[PDB]
Design an enzyme around this catalytic site. Structure first.
Site, mmCIF file in Angstrom:
data_model
loop_
_atom_site.group_PDB
_atom_site.id
_atom_site.type_symbol
_atom_site.label_atom_id
_atom_site.label_comp_id
_atom_site.label_asym_id
_atom_site.label_seq_id
_atom_site.Cartn_x
_atom_site.Cartn_y
_atom_site.Cartn_z
ATOM 1 C CG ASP A 1 -3.704 71.233 -58.165
ATOM 2 O OD1 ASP A 1 -4.542 70.618 -57.938
ATOM 3 O OD2 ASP A 1 -3.284 71.001 -59.528
ATOM 4 C CG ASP B 1 -7.381 68.578 -60.397
ATOM 5 O OD1 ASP B 1 -8.711 68.614 -60.778
ATOM 6 O OD2 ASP B 1 -6.400 68.881 -61.557
ATOM 7 C CG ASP C 1 -2.016 67.169 -60.084
ATOM 8 O OD1 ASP C 1 -3.213 67.822 -60.605
ATOM 9 O OD2 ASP C 1 -1.037 67.920 -59.931
#
Ligand SMILES: Nc1ncnc2c1ncn2[C@@H]1O[C@H](COP(=O)(O)OP(=O)(O)OP(=O)(O)O)[C@@H](O)[C@H]1O
Ligand SMILES: Nc1ncnc2c1ncn2[C@@H]1O[C@H](COP(=O)(O)OP(=O)(O)O)[C@@H](O)[C@H]1O
Ligand SMILES: *OP(=O)(O)OC[C@H]1O[C@@H](n2cnc3c(N)ncnc32)[C@H](O)[C@@H]1O
Ligand SMILES: [Mg+2]
Ligand SMILES: [Mg+2]
EC number: 2.7.7.-
Lengths: 513, 357, 226
Positions: B68, B120, B70
Site C-alpha cells: 500500500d 491510495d 499513500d
C-alpha cells in the site's frame, strides 16, 4: 575533510600483509584522490622489477562512472613496460605518477579463473578487487610469465600513435615463402588513398632497389581504379622489433639498438636509401618506412604470415618516432565476426532480377562471404557498384550469342527473384549444358507470405513449381530477404527437391508449412 | 548483542527494490500527469507521498500481495461550500483517461493498481485564507515536501523550505527545522469515511516527529517499529485484529525512551515501559488516551475496544518475557533461537545475462 | 502516430543502424543518433554502411546516409557519449519523445535511470542473445526508466549460455574476441524490432516479449503477463 570510504580504503591497505602506506589521501585540482603505497613480492625479484615497488592509487569520475587506476611512482616505481600494461612514460608535469597503468581487467592464463572472479559494484569491494589483481600482476611480471603458451600474441603498445591514420595491406599464408628468402633486403613500395574515407591508405605494389616490380596485390574493382604513388620503403626483419621485456622503441637510438641486436645496421640502410634516391631521378623522397617480420597467432606456434609495421620517416637522434597503425585486410581476416560455410562461399551465383528482394539478397550474400556473383537484369550496374563498394574482396559482374550463353553456363547456383512466369518459362527453355541448382523465391499479396522452391537438375522444372505455388513496407521485404538467404544457405548445404511456404503473423511470429 | 543477525533480519523484512522503484516512478508520473491536466490545472496545488512508505516503517507483504502506497493531493478548494463528494467527483475524468480499468473508489480514497504496488490517494484542502494560504502553499511546493526518498535514505532531511538535498561525490550547511509558529497551527481538511463531513489531518508534523525521534534514538526507531509489526504478523492467531497500522506505531513511539544503543536493548526497554505504563488501565479494563502529533484534540486510540487492548497487553507480556530471557543469555546460538521463537524463521542463525547489439 | 514523433536512438552499431534505416524508410523522419566511436573495416560484415564511411564517427556517417534516403528526411547527430556533459546538450536531448536503446550495455541502462528527463517518455530496450539466437524486447512509459524490472525480465528469460569456444579472435596480433552474428540474423531481428516498436508506440504500456528463431526458419514468441 577526508571522506569515510577513503579512510576505509586506507585501513584496508594497512591491514594487508603484503602492502604498506604512510601518506594520506590528497585531492588534486582535477578532482582526483590519490594515495601513495608500497607493494611487496612473494617471488624472487628480477632486474626489470624490484621487490618493493611504489604505486599511486587514483580515483576520479568523468560523467557518471568512477575510475579506479593504479599508476607507477615517478621516482621509485618500475620503469619498464610489460605485457598487459600501457606505456610507462614519465612527463615533465606536476603529476607524481607515470602513465603505465597495468590493465588489470585482462585475464592472463597465470591469473586463476577462481581468483579472477567478477568485478563488484561497491567502491570498497572494487578497490579490494583491483589491489588483489595488481598483486597477481606484479608477481607474474616478476616471473616473466605474463605471456605463456596458448595466449594470443598481442602487439606492444606504441607511444603517441595517431588514432586517425591507418594503412591497409593484404598478406596471406601463401605469401610467406616469397618473403622468407628476402631477410635483410630493402626496396620501394606504392600506396593509394581510399576514396571517400577519412585518413586511410592501402598498399598496392612492391618494387626492388632499382624500381622493378616483384609483387602486386589484388583488390576489388572499386579499389583498383586509383593512382599509385611510390612513397614508401620496405625492409624485412628476422623478428618483431620489441625491446625487453615488451617495450616498443620510442627513440631512433632504441630502434638502432634493436637493429644491431637483430644483426643489421640502421645507418647503413639509411645511406643506401639516400644513395639509391640520388641514383633514380624519378624518385622524389620516401615518406614512410615499412618493417616486415614473421608473426605467430599464438605463443608456442610457428610463424605463418608476414606482418608489416609503419613509421613516419637520423638513426642516432633522440627524437621520438611517429608510428602509424596498420591493418591486415586479407580475406580470412575480414569476417572474423561471422561468415558462411565454405561450400557456398566457393560457388558462382547468378541472380535474376535487381528489384527489391534481389538487391537485398545480393547484399546479404556479399556480406556473409559469397563474393562471386552475377547480376542479370540501370539497376544491375548500380547494384554491382554498390556491391563492389562493400568489402575489399568483392567481385561482382553485371550483365543470344554463344559466348554469352557459355558465360552464363559457367555459374553454379541460379536464383530467381523476379516473380514473373515468362522468366520461369525462359529458364525452362534455356540450355545450360550441365547440372545446376535452381532456386525460386517469391512474395505473396501484401507481403504476407513467401514461396520457396529449390531443384537441382539440368533443366528447370516449371510445371512442378507452378503446381506448388497454386497449392510494401521495407521491414517486410527485409524479413523475407533474411529468410530467403537462410533458405538458400540450407539448400546449397543439401541440394534436392524442396518446397516450403512461410507466413507472418500479427504478433510478430513466422510459421512454415 | 547479535547485531549482524538483527541487521540481516531487518534486510529480510524490508520491501524489495522492484517495488521501491515502482512506487517512486508511479508517484513521479502521477504528479506530472496531474500537473499537465487542463481541467484541474488551477485546482491542484501539490502532490506528495506520505504513509509508512515515507516514514520507512513498512514491511514486506507475505505472498504476491501489492504493498500500500499513500499519496495526498492538496487543492485550493473551499470546503465550506463544496461537499466531499463533489470534490472527489472532480477527479473521475482524469482517472478514466490516464488509468483506464485500473482505478476504483472506496471509502474516502481512490485506489490505483500498478504493476507491483497499489496507490491510495486522498483529496484534501487548505482551510486558511489570505497570506497564510500563500505561505502554506509555498511550504507545500518546496523540495522538503516534494521528495520521494524515505527517511532512512535522507538522514539530513529537515522540515524547511530552504533545505536542499545534500549530495556529495563520496559522502553542506545543516539547516534546521522551521519554527513551530509557521506550520504547527495550520492543519488540513479531508473527507470522512462516509464522505459526509470534513475532518482535520496534519501528516507533516507526524513525519517531522518521526524523523526527530529517529535522530534522537540513533536510527533505531523505524527498525523497532518494523520488528514489532513483523512480530504481530507472525503471532496473528494469539493476537486480536487491532491495533494495527498507525495506532501501533503511535504506541511504539510513545513507549520508547531517547538514547537507544542497540536493537535488543531497545526492544526490552520498550516492552518493559509499555507494561509499566498501562498496568493501571489494564487492571481496570479500559483503553489509553493518546493525542495525535498534528492535531492535539484528536485521540488516536478512538476506534479501539478495551478487550483488544487487554489481549494486546497479554501478548506484549509474553513477548517481554521471551525477550528478557533472550537478552541475558550469553551463548549466541541459544540467544538466536530465543529471538527466532518470536520473530520467526527470517531471523538468521550465527547473475548478469549477456546482451549484445 | 509514430510518423509525428521525435525518436532518439542510442548506439549506431549493428542493430541501431538497421533499425534507423528501416524507420527512415517507413516514414519516421525526425531522428537523432548518439554514438562516439569510429567505423572500421571489420564492422562492415554486419552493418548498414560501406567502405566509404571507414574512419568516420559512426553517428555522423549514419546521419548522412539517412539524410540521403528521402527528400523529407531530417536527422541530427550527437558525437558525445551518454550522458552528455554540457547542459545545452541535455536540453537538446530532452526534446525527444521516444528513447530507444540499442547498445547492449548495462552502464547505459544505469545512466538512463539516473538521467533527469523532466517529462513523460516512452522507453524501449532492444538487444540480442549469444549467437543471435533470440531477442530481448522491453518497453515502458514513465518519467524515469525502470532498470531493475528490465534486468529481472532479461534474467528470467531462457537464453543460451555463453561459451568461449565459438568466440573467435578479432584478428592476428590482437587479444579480445568478438561475438558471433551473421548479417541475416541481425536483419531479421531489426525487422522484428521495428514491428515491435510500432506496436508499442500504438499502445504504450509496460510490455516485455522474448523471441526465438528455429532451425527450420520459424520465429516463436514468449510474452510476459504483468
Ligand atoms: N488512527 C489514526 N490517527 C491518526 N492518523 C492516522 C490514523 N490512521 C491513519 N492515519 C494517517 O493516515 C496515514 C495512512 O493510514 P494507513 O491506515 O494506510 O496506515 P499506515 O501507517 O500506512 O499502515 P500500513 O503499515 O498498514 O501500510 C498514516 O500514515 C497516518 O498519517
Ligand atoms: N489516508 C489518510 N491520509 C491522511 N490522514 C488520514 C488518512 N486516514 C486517516 N487519516 C487521519 O486519521 C484520523 C483517524 O481517522 P479515522 O479513524 O478514519 O476517523 P473517522 O472514522 O472519523 O474518519 C482522521 O482524523 C484522519 O485525519
Ligand atoms: O552491438 P555493438 O557492440 O555494435 O553495439 C554497441 C554500440 O553502442 C554504442 N555505445 C555503447 N555504449 C555507449 C554509450 N555509453 N554512449 C553512446 N553509445 C554507446 C557503441 O558506440 C556501438 O555503436
Ligand atoms: Mg499505508
Ligand atoms: Mg492505506
Amino acid at each position: 575533510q577526508v571522506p569515510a570510504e577513503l579512510q576505509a580504503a586506507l585501513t584496508l591497505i594497512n591491514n594487508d600483509p603484503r602492502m604498506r602506506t604512510n601518506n594520506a589521501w590528497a585531492l588534486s585540482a582535477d578532482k582526483r584522490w590519490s594515495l601513495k603505497f608500497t607493494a611487496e613480492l612473494s617471488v624472487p625479484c628480477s632486474s626489470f622489477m624490484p621487490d618493493n615497488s611504489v604505486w599511486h592509487l587514483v580515483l576520479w569520475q568523468e560523467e557518471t562512472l568512477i575510475r579506479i587506476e593504479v599508476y607507477p611512482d615517478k621516482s621509485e616505481g618500475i620503469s619498464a613496460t610489460f605485457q598487459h600494461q600501457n606505456y610507462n612514460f614519465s612527463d615533465a608535469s606536476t603529476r607524481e605518477w607515470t602513465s603505465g597503468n597495468p590493465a588489470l581487467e585482462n585475464t592472463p592464463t597465470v591469473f586463476g579463473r577462481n581468483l579472477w572472479g567478477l568485478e563488484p559494484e561497491a567502491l570498497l569491494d572494487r578497490i579490494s578487487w583491483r589491489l588483489s589483481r595488481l598483486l597477481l600482476w606484479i608477481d607474474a611480471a616478476a616471473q616473466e610469465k605474463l605471456a605463456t603458451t596458448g595466449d594470443a600474441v598481442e602487439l606492444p603498445a606504441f607511444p603517441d600513435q595517431s588514432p586517425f591514420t591507418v594503412i591497409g595491406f593484404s598478406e596471406q599464408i601463401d605469401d610467406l615463402p616469397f618473403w622468407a628468402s628476402k631477410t635483410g633486403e630493402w626496396g620501394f613500395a606504392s600506396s593509394t588513398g581510399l576514396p571517400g574515407a577519412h585518413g586511410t591508405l592501402f598498399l598496392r605494389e612492391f618494387l626492388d632497389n632499382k624500381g622493378k616490380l616483384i609483387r602486386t596485390t589484388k583488390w576489388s574493382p572499386f579499389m583498383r581504379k586509383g593512382a599509385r604513388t611510390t612513397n614508401a620503403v620496405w625492409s624485412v626483419l628476422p623478428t618483431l622489433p620489441v625491446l625487453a621485456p615488451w617495450q616498443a622503441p620510442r627513440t631512433w637510438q632504441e630502434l638502432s639498438h634493436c637493429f644491431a641486436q637483430c644483426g643489421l645496421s640502421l645507418p647503413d640502410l639509411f645511406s643506401d636509401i639516400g644513395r639509391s634516391v640520388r641514383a633514380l631521378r624519378k624518385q622524389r623522397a620516401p615518406g614512410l618506412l615499412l618493417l616486415g617480420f614473421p608473426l605467430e597467432n599464438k605463443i608456442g606456434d610457428e610463424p605463418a604470415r608476414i606482418h608489416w609495421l609503419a613509421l613516419r620517416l637520423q638513426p642516432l637522434s633522440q627524437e621520438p618516432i611517429r608510428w602509424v597503425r596498420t591493418q591486415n585486410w586479407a580475406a580470412d581476416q575480414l569476417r572474423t565476426r561471422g561468415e558462411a560455410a565454405n561450400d557456398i562461399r566457393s560457388k558462382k551465383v547468378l541472380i535474376i532480377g535487381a528489384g527489391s528482394l534481389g538487391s537485398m539478397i545480393a547484399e546479404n550474400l556479399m556480406r556473409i562471404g559469397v563474393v562471386s556473383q552475377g547480376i542479370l537484369d540501370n539497376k544491375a550496374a548500380a547494384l554491382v557498384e554498390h556491391l563492389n563498394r562493400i568489402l575489399p574482396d568483392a567481385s561482382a559482374r553485371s550483365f543470344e550469342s554463344e559466348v554469352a550463353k557459355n558465360s552464363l553456363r559457367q555459374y553454379d547456383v541460379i536464383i530467381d527473384c523476379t516473380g514473373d512466369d515468362g522468366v520461369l518459362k525462359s529458364l525452362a527453355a534455356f540450355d545450360w549444358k550441365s547440372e545446376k541448382i535452381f532456386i525460386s523465391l517469391a512474395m505473396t499479396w501484401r507481403a504476407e507470405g513467401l514461396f520457396a522452391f529449390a531443384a537441382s537438375e539440368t533443366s528447370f522444372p516449371v510445371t512442378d513449381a507452378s503446381s506448388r505455388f497454386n497449392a510494401a513496407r521495407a521491414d517486410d521485404v527485409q524479413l523475407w530477404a533474411a529468410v530467403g538467404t537462410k533458405f538458400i544457405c540450407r539448400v546449397v548445404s543439401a541440394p534436392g527437391r524442396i518446397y516450403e511456404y512461410f507466413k507472418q503473423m500479427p504478433d510478430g511470429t513466422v510459421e512454415k508449412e | 548483542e547479535l547485531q549482524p543477525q538483527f541487521n540481516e533480519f531487518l534486510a529480510n523484512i524490508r520491501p524489495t527494490d522492484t517495488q521501491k522503484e515502482d512506487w517512486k516512478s508511479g508517484a513521479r508520473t502521477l504528479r506530472e500527469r496531474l500537473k499537465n491536466f487542463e481541467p484541474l490545472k488551477e485546482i491542484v496545488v501539490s502532490t506528495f507521498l506520505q504513509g509508512s512508505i515515507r516514514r520507512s516503517t513498512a514491511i514486506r507483504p507475505l505472498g504476491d500481495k501489492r504493498p500500500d502506497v499513500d499519496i495526498v493531493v492538496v487543492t485550493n478548494l473551499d470546503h465550506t461550500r463544496m461537499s466531499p463528494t463533489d470534490a472527489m467527483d472532480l477527479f473521475i475524468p482524469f482517472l478514466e483517461k490516464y488509468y483506464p480499468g485500473k482505478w476504483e473508489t472506496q471509502g474516502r480514497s481512490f485506489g490505483i493498481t500498478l504493476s507491483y504496488v497499489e496507490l491510495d490517494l486522498v483529496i484534501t484542502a487548505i482551510p486558511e485564507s489570505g497570506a497564510e494560504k500563500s505561505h502554506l502553499e509555498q511550504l507545500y511546493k518546496s523540495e522538503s515536501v516534494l521528495t520521494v526518498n524515505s527517511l532512512e535514505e535522507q538522514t539530513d532531511w529537515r522540515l524547511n523550505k530552504s533545505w536542499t538535498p545534500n549530495t556529495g561525490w563520496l559522502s553542506s550547511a545543516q539547516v534546521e527545522d522551521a519554527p513551530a509558529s509557521e506550520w504547527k497551527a495550520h492543519p488540513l481538511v479531508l473527507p470522512d469515511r462516509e464522505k459526509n463531513e470534513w475532518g482535520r489531518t496534519h501528516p507533516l508534523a507526524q513525519i517531522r516527529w518521526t524523523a526527530e525521534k529517529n535522530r534522537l534514538c540513533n536510527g533505531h526507531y523505524i527498525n523497532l517499529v518494523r520488528a514489532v509489526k513483523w512480530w504481530r504478523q507472525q503471532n496473528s492467531e494469539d493476537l486480536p485484529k487491532y491495533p494495527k497500522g498507525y495506532p501501533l506505531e503511535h504506541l511504539i513511539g510513545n513507549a520508547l525512551d531517547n538514547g537507544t544503543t542497540s536493537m535488543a536493548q531497545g526492544l526490552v526497554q520498550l516492552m518493559d515501559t509499555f507494561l509499566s505504563r498501562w498496568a493501571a488501565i489494564y487492571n481496570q479494563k479500559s483503553k489509553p488516551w493518546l493525542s495525535d502529533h498534528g492535531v492535539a484534540e484528536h485521540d488516536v486510540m478512538a476506534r479501539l475496544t478495551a478487550e483488544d487492548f487487554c489481549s494486546f497487553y497479554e501478548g506484549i507480556a509474553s513477548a517481554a518475557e521471551i525477550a528478557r530471557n533472550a537478552l541475558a543469555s550469553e551463548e549466541p546460538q541459544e540467544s538466536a533461537q530465543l529471538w527466532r521463537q518470536l520473530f520467526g524463521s527470517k531471523f538468521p542463525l550465527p547473475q548478469k545475462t549477456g546482451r549484445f547489439a
